[PDB]
Amino acid sequence: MDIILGIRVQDSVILASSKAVTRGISVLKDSDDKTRQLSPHTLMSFAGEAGDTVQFAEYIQANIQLYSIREDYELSPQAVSSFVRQELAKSIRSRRPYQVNVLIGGYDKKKNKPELYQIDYLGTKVELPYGAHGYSGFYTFSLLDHHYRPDMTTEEGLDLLKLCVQELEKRMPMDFKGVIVKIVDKDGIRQVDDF
Amino acid sequence: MDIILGIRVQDSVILASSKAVTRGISVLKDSDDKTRQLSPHTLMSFAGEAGDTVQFAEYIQANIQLYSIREDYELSPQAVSSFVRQELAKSIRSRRPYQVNVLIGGYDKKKNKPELYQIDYLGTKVELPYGAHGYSGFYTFSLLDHHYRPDMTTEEGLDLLKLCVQELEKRMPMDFKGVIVKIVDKDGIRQVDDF
Amino acid sequence: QFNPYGDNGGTILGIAGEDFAVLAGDTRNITDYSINSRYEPKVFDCGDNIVMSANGFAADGDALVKRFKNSVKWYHFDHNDKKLSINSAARNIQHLLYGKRFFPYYVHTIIAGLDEDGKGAVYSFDPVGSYEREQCRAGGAAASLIMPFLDNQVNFKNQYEPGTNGKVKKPLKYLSVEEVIKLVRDSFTSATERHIQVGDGLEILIVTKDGVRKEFYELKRD
Amino acid sequence: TQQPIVTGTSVISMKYDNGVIIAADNLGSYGSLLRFNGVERLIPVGDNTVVGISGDISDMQHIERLLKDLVTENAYDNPLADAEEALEPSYIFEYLATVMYQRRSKMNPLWNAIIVAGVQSNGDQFLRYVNLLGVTYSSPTLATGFGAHMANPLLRKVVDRESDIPKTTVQVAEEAIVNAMRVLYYRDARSSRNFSLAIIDKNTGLTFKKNLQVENMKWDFAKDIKGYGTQKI
Amino acid sequence: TTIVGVKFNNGVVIAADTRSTQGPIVADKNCAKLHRISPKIWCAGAGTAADTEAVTQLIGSNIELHSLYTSREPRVVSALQMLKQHLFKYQGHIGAYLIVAGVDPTGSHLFSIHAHGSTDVGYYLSLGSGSLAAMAVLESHWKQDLTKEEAIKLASDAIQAGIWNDLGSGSNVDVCVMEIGKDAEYLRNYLTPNVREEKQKSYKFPRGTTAVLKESIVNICDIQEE
Amino acid sequence: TTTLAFRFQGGIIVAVDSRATAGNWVASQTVKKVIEINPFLLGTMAGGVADCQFWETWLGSQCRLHELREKERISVAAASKILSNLVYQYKGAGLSMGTMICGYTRKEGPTIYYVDSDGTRLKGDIFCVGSGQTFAYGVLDSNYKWDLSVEDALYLGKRSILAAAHRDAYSGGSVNLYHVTEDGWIYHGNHDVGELFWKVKEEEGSFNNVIG
Amino acid sequence: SDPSSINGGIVVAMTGKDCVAIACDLRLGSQSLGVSNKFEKIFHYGHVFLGITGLATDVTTLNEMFRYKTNLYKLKEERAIEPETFTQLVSSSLYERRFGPYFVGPVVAGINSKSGKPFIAGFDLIGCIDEAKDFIVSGTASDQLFGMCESLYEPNLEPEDLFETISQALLNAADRDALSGWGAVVYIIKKDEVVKRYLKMRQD
Amino acid sequence: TSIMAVTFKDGVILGADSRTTTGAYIANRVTDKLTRVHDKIWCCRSGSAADTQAIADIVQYHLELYTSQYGTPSTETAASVFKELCYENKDNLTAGIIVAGYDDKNKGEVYTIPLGGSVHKLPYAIAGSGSTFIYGYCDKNFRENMSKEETVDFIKHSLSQAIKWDGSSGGVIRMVVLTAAGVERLIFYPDEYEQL
Amino acid sequence: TSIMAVTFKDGVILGADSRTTTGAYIANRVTDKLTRVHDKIWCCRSGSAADTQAIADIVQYHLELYTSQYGTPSTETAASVFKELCYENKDNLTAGIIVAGYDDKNKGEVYTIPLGGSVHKLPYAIAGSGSTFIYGYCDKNFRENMSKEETVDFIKHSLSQAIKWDGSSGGVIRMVVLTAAGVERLIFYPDEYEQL
Numbered sequence A, B: 001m002d003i004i005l006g007i008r009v010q011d012s013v014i015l016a017s018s019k020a021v022t023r024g025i026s027v028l029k030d031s032d033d034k035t036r037q038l039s040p041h042t043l044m045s046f047a048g049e050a051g052d053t054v055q056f057a058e059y060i061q062a063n064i065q066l067y068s069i070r071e072d073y074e075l076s077p078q079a080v081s082s083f084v085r086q087e088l089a090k091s092i093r094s095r096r097p098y099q100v101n102v103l104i105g106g107y108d109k110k111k112n113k114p115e116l117y118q119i120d121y122l123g124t125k126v127e128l129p130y131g132a133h134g135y136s137g138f139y140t141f142s143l144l145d146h147h148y149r150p151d152m153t154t155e156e157g158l159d160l161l162k163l164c165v166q167e168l169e170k171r172m173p174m175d176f177k178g179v180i181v182k183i184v185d186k187d188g189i190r191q192v193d194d195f
Numbered sequence C: 001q002f003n004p005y006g007d008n009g010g011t012i013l014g015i016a017g018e019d020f021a022v023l024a025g026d027t028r029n030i031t032d033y034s035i036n037s038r039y040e041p042k043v044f045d046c047g048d049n050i051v052m053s054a055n056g057f058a059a060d061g062d063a064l065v066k067r068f069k070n071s072v073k074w075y076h077f078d079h080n081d082k083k084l085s086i087n088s089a090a091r092n093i094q095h096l097l098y099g100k101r102f103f104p105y106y107v108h109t110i111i112a113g114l115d116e117d118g119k120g121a122v123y124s125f126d127p128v129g130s131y132e133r134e135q136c137r138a139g140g141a142a143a144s145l146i147m148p149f150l151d152n153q154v155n156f157k158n159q160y161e162p163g164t165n166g167k168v169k170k171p172l173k174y175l176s177v178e179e180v181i182k183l184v185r186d187s188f189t190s191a192t193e194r195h196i197q198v199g200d201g202l203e204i205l206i207v208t209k210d211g212v213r214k215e216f217y218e219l220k221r222d
Numbered sequence D: 001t002q003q004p005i006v007t008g009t010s011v012i013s014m015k016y017d018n019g020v021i022i023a024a025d026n027l028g029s030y031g032s033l034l035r036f037n038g039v040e041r042l043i044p045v046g047d048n049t050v051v052g053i054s055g056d057i058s059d060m061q062h063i064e065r066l067l068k069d070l071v072t073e074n075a076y077d078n079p080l081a082d083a084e085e086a087l088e089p090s091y092i093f094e095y096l097a098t099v100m101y102q103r104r105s106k107m108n109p110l111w112n113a114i115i116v117a118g119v120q121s122n123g124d125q126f127l128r129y130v131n132l133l134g135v136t137y138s139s140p141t142l143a144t145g146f147g148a149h150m151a152n153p154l155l156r157k158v159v160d161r162e163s164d165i166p167k168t169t170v171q172v173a174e175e176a177i178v179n180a181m182r183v184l185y186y187r188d189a190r191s192s193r194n195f196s197l198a199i200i201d202k203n204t205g206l207t208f209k210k211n212l213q214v215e216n217m218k219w220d221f222a223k224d225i226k227g228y229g230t231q232k233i
Numbered sequence E: 001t002t003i004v005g006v007k008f009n010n011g012v013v014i015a016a017d018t019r020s021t022q023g024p025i026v027a028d029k030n031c032a033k034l035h036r037i038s039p040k041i042w043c044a045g046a047g048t049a050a051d052t053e054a055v056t057q058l059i060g061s062n063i064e065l066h067s068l069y070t071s072r073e074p075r076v077v078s079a080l081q082m083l084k085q086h087l088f089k090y091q092g093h094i095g096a097y098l099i100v101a102g103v104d105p106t107g108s109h110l111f112s113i114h115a116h117g118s119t120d121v122g123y124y125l126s127l128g129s130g131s132l133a134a135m136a137v138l139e140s141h142w143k144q145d146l147t148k149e150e151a152i153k154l155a156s157d158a159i160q161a162g163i164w165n166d167l168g169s170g171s172n173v174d175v176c177v178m179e180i181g182k183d184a185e186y187l188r189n190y191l192t193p194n195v196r197e198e199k200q201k202s203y204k205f206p207r208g209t210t211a212v213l214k215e216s217i218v219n220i221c222d223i224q225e226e
Numbered sequence F: 001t002t003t004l005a006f007r008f009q010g011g012i013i014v015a016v017d018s019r020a021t022a023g024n025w026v027a028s029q030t031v032k033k034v035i036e037i038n039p040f041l042l043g044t045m046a047g048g049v050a051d052c053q054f055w056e057t058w059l060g061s062q063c064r065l066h067e068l069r070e071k072e073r074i075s076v077a078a079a080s081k082i083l084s085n086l087v088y089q090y091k092g093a094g095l096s097m098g099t100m101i102c103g104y105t106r107k108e109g110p111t112i113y114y115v116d117s118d119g120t121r122l123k124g125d126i127f128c129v130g131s132g133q134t135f136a137y138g139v140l141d142s143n144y145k146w147d148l149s150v151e152d153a154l155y156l157g158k159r160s161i162l163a164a165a166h167r168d169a170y171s172g173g174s175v176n177l178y179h180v181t182e183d184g185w186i187y188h189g190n191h192d193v194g195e196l197f198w199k200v201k202e203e204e205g206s207f208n209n210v211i212g
Numbered sequence G: 001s002d003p004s005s006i007n008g009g010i011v012v013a014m015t016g017k018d019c020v021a022i023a024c025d026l027r028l029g030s031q032s033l034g035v036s037n038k039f040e041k042i043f044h045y046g047h048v049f050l051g052i053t054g055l056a057t058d059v060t061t062l063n064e065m066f067r068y069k070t071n072l073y074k075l076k077e078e079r080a081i082e083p084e085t086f087t088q089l090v091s092s093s094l095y096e097r098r099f100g101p102y103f104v105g106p107v108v109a110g111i112n113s114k115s116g117k118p119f120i121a122g123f124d125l126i127g128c129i130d131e132a133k134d135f136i137v138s139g140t141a142s143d144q145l146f147g148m149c150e151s152l153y154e155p156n157l158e159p160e161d162l163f164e165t166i167s168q169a170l171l172n173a174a175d176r177d178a179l180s181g182w183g184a185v186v187y188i189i190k191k192d193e194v195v196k197r198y199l200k201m202r203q204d
Numbered sequence H, I: 001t002s003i004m005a006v007t008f009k010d011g012v013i014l015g016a017d018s019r020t021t022t023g024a025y026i027a028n029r030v031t032d033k034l035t036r037v038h039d040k041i042w043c044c045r046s047g048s049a050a051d052t053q054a055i056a057d058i059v060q061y062h063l064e065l066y067t068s069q070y071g072t073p074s075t076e077t078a079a080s081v082f083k084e085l086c087y088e089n090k091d092n093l094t095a096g097i098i099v100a101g102y103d104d105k106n107k108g109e110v111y112t113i114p115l116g117g118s119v120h121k122l123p124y125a126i127a128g129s130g131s132t133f134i135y136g137y138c139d140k141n142f143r144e145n146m147s148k149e150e151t152v153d154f155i156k157h158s159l160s161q162a163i164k165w166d167g168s169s170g171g172v173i174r175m176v177v178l179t180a181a182g183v184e185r186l187i188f189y190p191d192e193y194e195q196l
Ligand SMILES: *[B]([O])([O])[C]([C][C]([C])[C])[N]C(=O)[C]([C]C1=[C][C]=[C][C]=[C]1)[N]C(=O)C1=[C]N=[C][C]=N1
Pocket: E001, E002, E019, E020, E021, E022, E023, E027, E031, E033, E045, E046, E047, E048, E049, E050, E052, E128, E129, E168, G123, G124, G128
């Protein structure tokens, strides 16, 4: 699919993902949720080749949920991100690689810190205060470089995120039909229904 | 460029043309007028390869204006359309052909009839009640096939045109940043400033 | 580089009657601009009152027919000598063809016979196993020449009744076996004239409740 | 997938009233180089079948070994190996046809064109073709390569349809075959003057003729041909 | 296409089939492949149909002017030379494969021409997709000192071989005889061994069978007086 | 090909054309592009004629086996995912499919899944698939409401296919209508475009561009 | 990509007893997209009729070119051009673009005004003349037209009977072609009257 | 094609086969590859039939015009005209020509002109596809100042072997003898030269 | 490469040049292309050096194992083992091998195995790039039942010409004589064979 963004503030991680699905000439859907809950305090957004994206996301989801049941314990965002990276790093030298890029936003309940991990289809992992995949960064990183503050509140983060989406809606050629925004914090995962 | 539409009603011709200009990754402009007035009662909209479009349009504009001065007389839309077709039909077997598609909307003051001509870059001319170039027709022709009646008013034409633009804004992937609408009738050419 | 496919030309035609069914095919076999044989049978009695032809690349055609005949034999063994119905045969052939989806049998298959209500039946296939029951179907080289003629003269397409001028259609009255054979012969005579891969001979297989009969007619040899 | 290296050209054949005739030249070409001049391309199987092979010679020698092995295998635990349960032309052909089509299906073909000529148990004439693609067909006259283009037209003037077979004697049939071989020598750039011929008759059995030569050739008229248009000397 | 040329006692004969094809479809069943360059110089053409026609007309036109300029009946070698130099210049792109024959004050002549511009001399020649079937017949039955009757028979038999055995050839046999000291006789459809049999059924429709929307008279006449 | 399906008050409407083409050659005007998977499930066909037929009749065998094993009607979600997971295994091999899996269960209600040979699986209210999908979308989007009567919904589907049959060269022949309720689908006839076009033009006042 | 099948269309012509008929479909498209249902492909210059299939821009260009030439012919000759003579003019004009040809399939039809003899003729895109006694076909459904004509046609058909035959030949051939149809026209041509009929057909 | 020219005591002899091929089909089995550009200046042609005919025709024209102005041209001059055409049009031509001629002053001379358009004056020359198979034989058997009968035998035996091994060569062996006595044509048929 | 094997009255002789080339560079000017697969069964190698070495090594192994079980193998048997490797691996091999051997029962025998993997039993055989230039010479000069000295001269003269004309051939002429008397190696240097 197209645009996926992420920003880590003081006490939470915010992921924004486009709603459009386009097969060639037509926009088949304008309300698609490009994300899966891996665990109560870990959310993964994704974008890449059709089919592979959902297949990969649900596969990761199933594996983490299996771990949760087996150990009766939630893996740290760092641990989940490492697992995901390894799966993609394994995939890149396969017969047919997963063509999927992801952002992993989690809240570590042990350290009481929000964490954002950017991983591409090659298995390239980086921890970041803010991140993006595809052409999204090209428009948004300059704004984030200027405004981002780490002590930012969640509300200040959403405002900075609106400024990013406005720039994208001005300068990007493709109509991505707006974004679904989700927040990850100490209380879990919730969706901002008005954006 | 992208989307250009045309519709011939009872007493006028209405042309609608997108405002976006995109060079690759960015939308450089969102207020571009993809049309030239050839004569007081003849308007030509255009879309094709960058540079060639404006170069061709202005070249045709210059030639028609020259004819107007020489004869102190306005050529009929049919005559202008035939001239344009021949120029494109000449162009297609050149060293480097003009990569331009056009719509010609005019009001014939002799016959008191509006006239719409669709011409592609090969020099393929057809007179139509409604027409389009590129992928625009793919979305809009089904609506026009249903609603068009040959005796509509100018206001009914604009409403049917809004229904076309709404469908395009729903189902086309590219954000074409709205359209500039112009009306051609017995009194000449005017622009609808709110659409 | 080795090309595992070839084109042996030929043309075939199946028509379904009210209580009968015919499956015709020319006897000419070719490669490029040469004739291999003027009489090489292309339509086959496969048993259980079912006739079959697989037109196109002859080596794949012969392979497919051979495997279907074999399927009929094993159907009898495995299900107490039960008669293989035409609809069942058709579905079995789909799986034979689709089994080689990624290295296809390069043929246009048509089978004919009677359904379980005794009425005439014709089934048509593409190379990778899709199928559909039809009243009328031409296959192979001159299929584009013959089908339109059969839309007009079998299904009375674009025909209407005099005096009414386009209001009332020509009624779809049934065609006898003698009437169908006339249309088959003319279809191939016409196809032979304008298509270089059609000629030499015409072999028709007729299927009724009484069994499978054969008729042969000469075609132009140029 | 391969390319043919050492190759054999046309094989020609036809039916007649009491049997079948088949012929092929003794050349093994290496591209345009006429490398090997003593290659037998007709291979008899028993006293009722002759297999003519054109195309790649290494593959021909492989097929020759398969047929030799087929005879050995048929004789095993078979008291009627030289009588009722002897190898028929139809048996030998169907076997080859199976192999050819299987090999093309694995994208590794035997690069040949084959004609199986013979007479069956009931006296019936057998003549059928098969090639690298597994394509098969039968006809009163059959020929491979250049023979298909030049020999068949001549042989079809003798036997045009099925009803012409009883009316065609062995003398008339052999005469037509020998002439066709002459024509191929005039016109095929990968042919030789030396050839082999085989007759299989229902009465007189298998007659295998070796070291035949094209004779009665017309070349004298060449002396009168000068230049390419305007030249007189 | 099957086209042949055969020399005989007192002249030369050329023949051709009448089939033209676009891929596997027959475009024309009774096509005319024998072309007149001048009254007693004819040629048969294989390959690209428009090219054989065009290159024949052009040289035939220039031959006529040359004959008028020199006050002499045209020669086959002149037609041959003008054809080959034209085809050579176009480097094979003009797809004309010709058998050129004729009688002139020098005698009777028979030549072949290929698209790249190479020429050949012979007593018997064949060109086209059916040239192998025809050349088989010619190589089997040709002799020196053929009569007129024997040469016509041999030429037509060589075309028939193409008609029956080559899918690129068919329908009828056209012949043109060019004897010394006589008018050239052009025998159109010399043989007709491919008449279509009567159809089983008449497909004449009842009047009114087709649905019509509008009728109108078309004005083909000029602007009228009064 | 033009195939559509949309959710509404009265369940689901499914409408398809009948044309099959090999290049410019019209191979068939009488193709059944709706597959009756069972009395409650329908599948639409677009793309490769054989791929769609084979694997959608195969799907019906998997659904029958599910309800034999689980003593319960298979969900539309589960049925659609069986097909999407299958074609995903073949991804890259060259299967060519665009399909809607349509059904009506107690737990889900009326449900439509777009399933595709690249592995895409999408739930939605409206879908149009095929070469003439853009034409059908125009009529649907402007006239669609949740509060349509079964009669009006059926006509809208019929009309949307007609629109695409007219303009798209690779669509036409005839229109097959299906209406899916919770007690199963209901067939609503074969409609020849040759007769339907003139009937609609006259009665609706549409297609004033064409002369009749 | 293939110029001769971007726009689509067909033309067919036939002879009868003291008459000729020429017919064409009305479709103009951009590959799969249908654009126009009023694109007539038959034109006339005096009593000589010319149908042209293929690339639409060249159809228009050639019509304008032959109108140009036939108008000069008439001024200089002081008479209308005849079918036989026009056929040669078409051939000459096409062959002059030998290595940069117009992508078209022209068809000529008409009755010679002096002899009264019916006349039809066809061409390839570069000038070769096909002069058939019975019928001529052209366009994207030429294979289909060959099959219809070869079975339906008989010689010496009366004008009103010939109309039925040629119409059924066109209609059924067009219905088996994706790029043809969207209406049809038939011209019946006698020595001194010419009737034009538009046919009702399926609009898909 | 198998062609050769050989100088000897009394002059020079040209030799050639008569086979023209389109792939494996023999388009002409009785071809004349020994062509005349002047009374006693001939050439052997190999490569494209069209190219070598076109070239030979142009040369004959040049030498005819030379003769009208300056009298009989030398063999060297004829070779130079061949070279000028072959060298300057090397990109568009496929022609391997051997030029042979008889002067009274210079006697028998042979010039070979391969694909590139270079000129090489030699005692004898061989060319064409079939020449490859007789380099060994010709090198071992050639002597200078042979007699007419010996040279005919040398050419007959050499081309016989070239024909035997090369599929692109065959038919009759044509020869042309160039001496002070005049111009003699010789032909040798398969039955004769195959048994050698 | 210029290689040949020739049967004669007392047995068979193998002959070869000594040049190995990488393009136009002579990687080895003193190569030994006559290799031993059994006591009196040798072969000449042409084509890829790696392929023909690998093949010859495998054959020597097979015949060594054959000998241990069934005694001395025939030359025909050795040729069949070469064929089996060359035919079955025709897609991956570039090897043109001549097999030559001496039995007491069968005396001197020569089998040639070209690229395809076919087998041809011949009185004598030639192969390698340089063989093309001596088909004419060898056909004209070969006789059956020659003496040792005559056969040495025939091979020496033949390879001399092949070396002279082929750039891929050169260096010394190696030979190996196979008779009832035993195995003899012969070498002939440029100064000797160039003046022939
Ligand atoms: B014959 O097969 O050579 C025949 C003789 C011709 C000169 C009347 N030639 C053709 O029929 C050619 C074959 C061909 C097809 C395609 C490209 C080149 C040649 N036919 C035509 O030139 C042709 C095709 N369609 C219409 C008119 N002419």
